[PDB]
Design a protein around this ligand. Structure first.
Ligand SMILES: Nc1ncnc2c1ncn2[C@@H]1O[C@H](COP(=O)(O)OP(=O)(O)NP(=O)(O)O)[C@@H](O)[C@H]1O
Ligand SMILES: Nc1ncnc2c1ncn2[C@@H]1O[C@H](COP(=O)(O)OP(=O)(O)NP(=O)(O)O)[C@@H](O)[C@H]1O
Ligand SMILES: [K+]
Ligand SMILES: [K+]
Ligand SMILES: [Mg+2]
Ligand SMILES: [Mg+2]
Ligand SMILES: [Mg+2]
Lengths: 529, 529, 76
């Protein structure tokens, strides 16, 4: 169709207006005391939120060129939560600050390419300072604090996540579920979670992430490659007649006809899944045969006498829930007797002392923790579907953010980390005047989130920033501003801490999109109507 | 329908506006550090590209007369890529420079016909200098460098193409494929290449570049002309029952009824294709019979007693993929046992000694080279299917651009080749003042692409051009400006080289469309309701 | 330009070119956060040094040779 193209300064003017309109709506919700944003619900009562993520989800503009800026920042900010579980609003605030100051420097005659070089160097220094400042998570104290701050300062979810984390282990597996009961509880249902991919991307059931999730499924397990389709049809048809899903565990499947025909015949109905084996070697059977007996099923091959012509729906493995990722597979629960399952666990207990392969001993004591400690399923409960939907994604983000803290460390929150890291830019020096402007842009940007948090709470941002800088030398690096009550204190001791990945990714992501828009020279969009 | 006609200077004014809007959007992406262009994707996040080809594909204007100029330049610039792989953006930049300067000269009172004569005369001198400046490709070093520059300065794609080139030989055949694997790999399949194309024009399939592609076809080999369709039908119906396409290799097909009944009788089904039998003389059968056993089958002829009403599908030849051009055909690889196929290579190896005539002995040891070296399959992988489309196009073009370098040579890149060639115009002289203006138009145009590359990277174009002219005699002809790192160096040693076909075709194509629009006197277009 | 013409009668285009260069570069410095009053004080010090240097390069007019050369150049 016919398209209108905008060039040069006009193009960036459109982007700046779109980014500002997005950021001004979202930045008012930053911090623990963010202001209210009211969102229309047609034929319903307007929704009042202080979430930021909720506000950003609804923002879309009529002007295609202004919408270009809003969507670009939205995607980059959304990627921060997809990796770190937090920082969506912080990334948007940083993106606006860098872009607005970058345009000011260019308007004064500075070279846009040299500004990006200064921005790139400044971000690298800031990231390194964050690495030095972060400290590793030590135990339940910090994990609870991170989960509480990751959520909207609610200690109930923080306690549940901390209990769930210490149950399945510091680096175990946590999953989130729901129920009609108003109360929320943690159940340590036995399961496992290993890095296994699935055999064909056609097993998409509901998530848009091209992943698969199952409820009350039946498990087929094989010690070798998948057999012909006709051997599975008595199982494929009868179990569908029985009204339950299916999944096949085997080493490999041929993609010429077997992969396509299996899903094509079931594409119009509930569909089924198929997954790979973990690790390498014959000790796959140690995982495979255990999972077969821990889920009440069998491993099928013609060398064991289990003829494929006489398959009966009762050799299937049975479990509560199965979730399949792009590179990981986790199975929750089991319909067999737990005493016999735990009796069959004793084989894994004896496999601790009897196995002779290090590659399995590395995954041993994890086959027990996910079962003996159980895969942590959080059963979110609420009195209304709307609250259930809100709390459901609320818990997973807090769970994901907590896992990020363990992987990389924790840092004082409230924007103190970026303030401390920006102090290194005070001595970073370059030989190019324009690159120096790029460095000063990042220093100003790093000190914006703390000012916005103070402003939302009702305090002057620049007064708070100055005192936080002074307390960096008088008291310590971790001293900052507690916007919840309105006084200066040690942020780490108070428990106001953030995962260090959140701070690292947010500044890196924000500088990438801002630098992209600073050198955008043309916008191509269709003419409306 | 009713139409509106625009005459004279008004007509060229419409074209200039359309060409400028196209060129201004695309020229900002020229070079290794081109600026970003943001393209709207409805119901999706905007797409950011520095490609130029991607930008040009999306450009279309509402005004029918301005759209005339954009489409004319787009087609001519696109033909440059279709012939030499690269140079789409460079041709567009040159076209704008010639057209804009040509209009200026005409506005001063110069004769448009004499300007065109000067332009054609100047282009001929420039092309001759380009051939004089080019050097032949010597080995893997230049082949890898050309492929890297043809791609987006990615050494991974360059290495694979260089490895594929040396594996099959500089005159073999290469094709690009994809798989589920994220990583990309090179596959040498037991294939061959030939020099005879299709038998009917209806066999051309969907792909935009009109190169017909067939998947999982069966092969029929005939030693004489095709018999009536009534003998083919028992094969065709059974092959259709088998569910795979079928290919017929034969000498000729009757045009009275068979040329239509072959295609019309299958237009409603999976359809089939036929290909001319390659080779000449009695060695045609040697070209056929050896290939048939290389593809796991043998020839069939009604007059030999093998009636098509009784042939069996296992007796036919089978191959992975079959690729046919207008004047050429290739087979990717037979599906039979490789050990027997490699054993059957001895039967072609013995043809060095067991065959007398030297006419195909020139093609002998090349058919062996097509066998021993195989056919290169570039298995491209990407993190997502959308990125796979982006990467597949670039790799295919880089292969095509690399083959162009072998045919004609290489020249220093970065626009240095056109700068060096334009210096010969300083001494070219004509007796007509207006024809001298046309010569000076080409000289200015040839020095535009280097200035655009310098400007995109963040340097003054005229300052860079002036120093490159000085380095032409202080250091050497190959010295130019590197845009990846802002310093002057020898381009050939640095590996910043371009196929000399790309530079030759781009200037020739750009001057042709510019000359056409300079003397355009009327534009006829329908009234938009 | 008006003051230069009143005082010297020549160099008005050079003075206008110089004035734009000082103003354009001063805005760039101010946009980076520099104090406008200190920039003026720095500019004043530099001009004092520059004027002293120009007088060092000054050569007295020996006679008709320089008089003709000056008149020729100023008359384009
Ligand atoms: N009591 C507090 N005092 C000061 N800062 C706080 C306090 N509690 C949280 N913060 C900081 O406020 C920020 C969190 O606010 P929030 O609105 O969740 O921002 P976000 O995480 O970028 N957005 P979202 O993706 O919606 O969670 C972080 O920088 C926290 O460290
Ligand atoms: N490092 C470099 N320094 C200077 N010039 C370079 C460098 N790398 C590539 N070039 C030149 O830049 C041009 C390639 O840019 P590109 O944007 O691909 O132009 P194009 O090939 O005309 N367009 P497309 O068809 O989209 O690839 C050629 O003239 C190259 O010789
Ligand atoms: K908030
Ligand atoms: K480019
Ligand atoms: Mg948060
Ligand atoms: Mg190119
Ligand atoms: Mg004068």
């Amino acid at each position: 169709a016919a398209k209108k193209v905008i060039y040069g300064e006009d193009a960036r003017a459109r982007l700046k207006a779109g980014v500002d309109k997005l950021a001004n709506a979202v930045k008012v919700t930053l911090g623990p005391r963010g202001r209210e944003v009211i969102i229309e619900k047609k034929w319903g009562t307007p929704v009042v939120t202080k979430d930021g993520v909720t506000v950003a989800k609804e923002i879309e503009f009529k002007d295609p060129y202004e919408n270009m800026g809003a969507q670009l920042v939205k995607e980059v900010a959304s990627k921060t939560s997809d990796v770190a579980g937090d920082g969506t609003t912080t990334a948007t605030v940083l993106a606006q600050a860098i872009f607005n100051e970058g345009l000011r420097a260019i308007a004064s005659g500075a070279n846009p390419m040299d500004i990006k070089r200064g921005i790139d160097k400044a971000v690298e220094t800031v990231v390194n300072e964050i690495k030095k400042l972060s400290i590793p998570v030590s135990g339940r104290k910090e994990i609870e604090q991170v989960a509480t701050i990751s959520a909207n300062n609610d200690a109930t979810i923080g306690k549940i996540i901390a209990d769930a984390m210490e149950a399945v282990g510091k680096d175990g597996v946590i999953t989130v579920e729901e129920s009609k009961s108003a109360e929320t509880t943690l159940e340590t249902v036995q399961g496992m979670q290993f890095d296994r991919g699935y055999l064909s991307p056609y097993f998409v059931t509901n998530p848009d992430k091209m992943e698969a999730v199952l409820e009350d499924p039946f498990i087929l397990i094989y010690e070798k490659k998948i057999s012909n389709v006709k051997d599975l049809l008595p199982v494929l048809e009868n179990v569908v007649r029985a009204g339950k899903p299916l999944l096949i565990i085997a080493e490999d499947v041929e993609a010429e006809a077997l992969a396509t025909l299996v899903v094509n015949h079931i594409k119009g109905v509930i569909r089924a899944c198929a997954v790979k084996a973990p690790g390498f070697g014959q000790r796959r059977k140690d995982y495979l045969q255990d999972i077969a007996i821990l889920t009440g099923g069998t491993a099928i091959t013609e060398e064991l006498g289990i003829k494929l012509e006489s398959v009966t729906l009762d050799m299937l493995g049975r479990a509560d829930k199965v979730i399949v990722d792009k590179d990981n597979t986790t199975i929750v629960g089991g319909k067999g007797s737990k005493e016999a399952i735990q009796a069959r666990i004793e084989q894994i207990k004896r496999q601790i002392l009897e196995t002779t392969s290090d590659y399995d001993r590395e995954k041993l004591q994890e086959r027990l923790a996910k079962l003996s400690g159980g895969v942590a399923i959080i059963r979110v409960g609420a009195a209304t579907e709307a609250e259930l939907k809100e709390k459901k994604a609320r818990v997973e983000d807090a769970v994901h953010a907590t896992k990020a803290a363990v992987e990389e460390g924790i840092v004082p929150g409230g924007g103190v980390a970026l303030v401390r890291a920006s102090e290194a830019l005070d001595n970073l020096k370059v030989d190019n005047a324009d690159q120096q402007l790029g460095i000063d842009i990042i220093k100003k940007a790093c000190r914006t989130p703390i000012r916005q948090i103070a402003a939302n709470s009702g305090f002057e941002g620049y007064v708070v920033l100055e005192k936080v800088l002074q307390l960096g030398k008088e008291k310590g690096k971790n001293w900052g501003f507690d916007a919840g009550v309105g006084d200066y204190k040690d942020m780490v001791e108070a428990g106001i801490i953030d995962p260090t990945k959140v701070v690292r990714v947010a500044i890196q992501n924000a500088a990438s999109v801002a630098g992209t828009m600073l050198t955008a020279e043309a916008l191509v969009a269709e003419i409306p109507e």
